[PDB]
Structures are given as C-alpha cells and as structure tokens.
Design an enzyme around this catalytic site. Structure first.
Site, PDB file in Angstrom:
ATOM      1  N   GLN A 161       0.858  -1.408  -0.126  1.00 33.76           N
ATOM      2  CA  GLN A 161       0.023  -0.240   0.151  1.00 33.76           C
ATOM      3  C   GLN A 161       0.789   1.186   0.125  1.00 33.76           C
ATOM      4  O   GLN A 161       0.717   2.061  -0.959  1.00 33.76           O
ATOM      5  CB  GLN A 161      -0.990   0.092   1.100  1.00 33.76           C
ATOM      6  CG  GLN A 161      -1.857  -1.167   1.065  1.00 33.76           C
ATOM      7  CD  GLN A 161      -2.870  -1.213   2.393  1.00 33.76           C
ATOM      8  OE1 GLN A 161      -2.656  -0.646   3.507  1.00 33.76           O
ATOM      9  NE2 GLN A 161      -3.781  -1.774   2.200  1.00 33.76           N
ATOM     10  N   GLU A 162       1.942   1.331   0.875  1.00 31.03           N
ATOM     11  CA  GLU A 162       2.799   2.484   0.797  1.00 31.03           C
ATOM     12  C   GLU A 162       3.558   2.649  -0.568  1.00 31.03           C
ATOM     13  O   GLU A 162       3.631   3.826  -0.992  1.00 31.03           O
ATOM     14  CB  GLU A 162       3.870   2.293   1.848  1.00 31.03           C
ATOM     15  CG  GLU A 162       4.595   3.654   2.307  1.00 31.03           C
ATOM     16  CD  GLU A 162       5.578   3.506   3.468  1.00 31.03           C
ATOM     17  OE1 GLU A 162       5.494   2.336   3.871  1.00 31.03           O
ATOM     18  OE2 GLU A 162       6.411   4.562   3.623  1.00 31.03           O
ATOM     19  N   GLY A 163       3.925   1.514  -1.003  1.00 26.94           N
ATOM     20  CA  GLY A 163       4.689   1.249  -2.216  1.00 26.94           C
ATOM     21  C   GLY A 163       3.764   2.042  -3.492  1.00 26.94           C
ATOM     22  O   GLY A 163       4.003   2.947  -4.007  1.00 26.94           O
TER      23      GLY A 163
END
Ligand SMILES: Nc1ncnc2[nH]cnc12
Length: 404
Positions: A126-128
């Site tokens: 998700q961060e990526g």
C-alpha cells in the site's frame, strides 16, 4: 469547483497532518506559501499504546488546524484519512484499539467526511503504491500510458518497496502474502501496478541480515575501530571489524549472500528471495528512489546542500563504498557528521554496498542508469514529501463525483 483533502500520517515518533487543496484540474493550489498545510505533533500514537482514547486526543490540535484551514462550506465534502505505520509492533490489539479511537474521534470531533476505510495501517505494498501515485502525480504522468510513468523504490527502516506500472498482459500473467498487482484507476485510466514489499530488507533490518551471515565472527562490512553490537528487533548482532578492518570485496560477497540472490526462482524472473520481479519494462525505466535511498547519499556528502533529492547512478554508491570501506570510524565520523548524528558511522561501508547491491544485483538496475533519489520532490516551486500522503489524498479526491 475545488476540493480539499486532509491526510494524517501517524508515524512512530509523531503525527503529521497534511491538508491539500485541489483545483478543478486536480492541480494543487497553494495554501499560504506552500502547496499544502502541514504540521506535526509529538509524540506519536505509539506513546499512548496503553491509552487509546488519549492516542486519538493527541491529534486533536492538528485536526483543529485542518478545520480552520478548510473553509467551513467545504468541510462536509472534504475527505479525511489517517494512515499509520510500526504501530503493528504494539502488544495485543493495542494497534486496533488506537485506530478505532481515532475513527471515533474523527467522527465525534470533526466535520469532515469520514469514510469507512478512512483510518488504517498503511502496509508495505500500500505504501509503495501510494508513493507511486505521489510521484507520478507530481510529475504529471497520471492518465498517461503505463510506459510514461516513473517507478518507485522506497528503502524504509524495516522493508524496501518496489512499485511500477505494467501491462494488462503482465498483470493477468502474474503469479498467484501481499498480491503482486494492485489495480488503480487514476484520472479514469486503469493501471496495473506491480507492487512488492521486502520485509527484512529495509535500511535498519538489512544490517541484521548482513550481520547474520557472519554469526559470532567479525564482519568485513564493519569499519575499523568499532567492535560492538547491533540491535535490531530486540536481537543482538555482533558488529566488529576484522583486524584488517572493512573490505569492500568481502563485504559485497556477504551482502550477496544476505540478499539471497541465489534463492530459486518459481516464476519467470526474480529479484531475490524468490520474488517475482514483475517483468520490468518501460514502467520501470525511470525511477524515483525514496527515503534511505536519499538519506545515505545525503549523509555521505553526495547531495548539494539545501537539496532534497539528487540524480545518481548506482555506480556512484559503489565508487563511494570503495573509498569508505578503507576508512575507520574516526575518519568517517569526521568526514560525515550526519552519520554520527544518526549513530550509524560503523555501518557506512555496509550501507553503501547494500544499496549498490540491492539496486543492481537485487533489482536489476544498470549501474550506469540515472535515477532520482529523494526525500522530497519538486512541485512547482515547492517540495512535496516523497511519501504516501499526497498519493493517498489524490486517490481520495479522485473518488469524488466531478473529479471523476
Ligand atoms: N539524513 C537522514 N539520515 C537518516 N535518517 C533520516 N531521517 C530523516 N533524515 C534522515
């Protein structure tokens, strides 16, 4: 005609609020003299693990500021979100109680539009994928064909993320843990994003993997003049230089082992650890490398002062390690005070070779290919954090009718 968005980033040592104002074309409007309103408080939600109602209360001054920034007529239609890291390391279900207390506080104390998925932990992939959106947003690539987008690599403390757009072919082909493809529609264009987070291969975590290779023995990844202990995730690792000190060649070999380059590949091609590489391609030709990919160069004097990013080739890291791996702790401490600030002088050689290895041997980047590394990226005359918040806001605003 315009829309605001409020994004909280609840990090390990503090909480930050970002408020953005998007115009009709999804271009950021200035708020005062920046392209966002931003403020921070400390400590973070983790400081109040034992008292979730207070963890949520910690954010209230920031919320109030966001409330004042967004004119009252827009409040109803303005999304508010909170992404937390770290917070998982909390005992029992302190994690979830905190997130719920935040939801309750947002619902009780704000006038903003709180959606069911507003408050969450932002994993890994998700961060990526949010970072991918931040960066391609800033660079004006959203809505362009996948081949004109810029892939992202983020070297966090615990994990490293790789995110880049692929073909629908490639997505469909994708191997059947975090799924390898994340589907996102941006400005009405569907993208298939190859996403992977490598646990244990963040900047801090990687040192432990590296030091495990040598078990109780001295490591050639450690500078002359340190004979100590590295602690990661409550494990101790002996970190002592051999008599001849660090050695680029031997450290590199150890790093290659630590990366598990030789792990068998169950798919078409792998990076390391048997992980599918996502197949490469045009989406991965231009890259923006975030967080520790910038911090290290900055700390060893590779970056012009007053700059938040730089262009570099991976060979630059190798060439730097070739010098640094001959130096001792006093030499490096004196040369590079920022490493001393961050208490990582002994690991200078290790960190450089690791980044070189991760990029080249691990992710298959050409050592001569220029990439951009940064903690911030230029947007107009301002700088936007090379992190997930803005991408998160963009996604949130793109769900509004009108913005489409
Ligand atoms: N230069 C730097 N080095 C290590 N960690 C950081 N966090 C923020 N800036 C940093």
């Amino acid at each position: 005609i315009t829309s605001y968005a409020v994004v909280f980033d609840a990090g390990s040592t503090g909480s930050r609020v970002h408020v953005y104002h998007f115009d009709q074309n999804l271009d950021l409007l200035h708020i005062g003299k920046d392209v966002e309103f931003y403020n921070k408080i400390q400590p973070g939600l983790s400081a109040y693990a034992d008292n979730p109602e207070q963890a949520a209360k910690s954010l209230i001054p920031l919320l109030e500021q966001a409330e004042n920034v967004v004119p009252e007529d827009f409040h109803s239609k303005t999304p508010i979100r909170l992404g937390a890291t770290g917070l998982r390391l909390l005992d029992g279900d302190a994690s979830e109680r905190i997130l719920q207390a935040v939801r309750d506080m947002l619902n009780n104390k704000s006038t903003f539009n709180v959606q069911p998925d507003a408050v969450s932990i932002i994993d890994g992939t998700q961060e990526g994928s949010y970072l991918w959106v931040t960066i391609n947003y800033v660079l004006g690539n959203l809505g362009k064909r996948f081949t004109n987008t810029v892939g992202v690599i983020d070297l966090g403390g615990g994990s490293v993320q790789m995110a880049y757009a692929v073909s629908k072919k490639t997505a469909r082909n994708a191997p059947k843990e975090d799924p390898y493809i994340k589907k996102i529609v941006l400005k009405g264009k569907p993208y298939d994003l190859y996403v992977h987070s490598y646990l244990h291969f963040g900047r801090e975590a990687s040192r432990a993997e590296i030091l495990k290779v040598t078990h109780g023995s001295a490591s050639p990844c450690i500078l002359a003049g340190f004979d100590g202990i590295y602690t990661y995730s409550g494990e101790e690792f002996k970190a002592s230089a051999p008599t001849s000190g660090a050695n680029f060649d031997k450290c590199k070999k150890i790093i290659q082992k630590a990366l598990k380059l030789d792990y068998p590949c169950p798919y078409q091609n792998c990076t390391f650890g048997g992980i599918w590489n996502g197949g490469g391609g045009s989406g991965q030709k231009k890259l923006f490398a975030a967080s520790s990919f910038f911090y290290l160069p900055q700390d060893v004097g590779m970056v012009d002062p007053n700059k938040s990013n730089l262009k570099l080739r991976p060979v630059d890291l190798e060439n730097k390690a070739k010098i640094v791996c001959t130096l001792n702790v006093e030499d490096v401490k004196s040369a590079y005070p920022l490493l001393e600030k961050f208490n990582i002088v002994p690991y200078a050689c290790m960190d450089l070779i690791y980044q070189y290895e991760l990029l080249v041997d691990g992710f298959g980047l050409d050592p001569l290919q220029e990439i951009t590394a940064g903690e911030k990226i230029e947007y107009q005359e301002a700088l936007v954090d090379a992190a997930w918040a803005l991408g998160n806001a963009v996604e949130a605003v793109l769900l509004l009718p009108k913005f489409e």
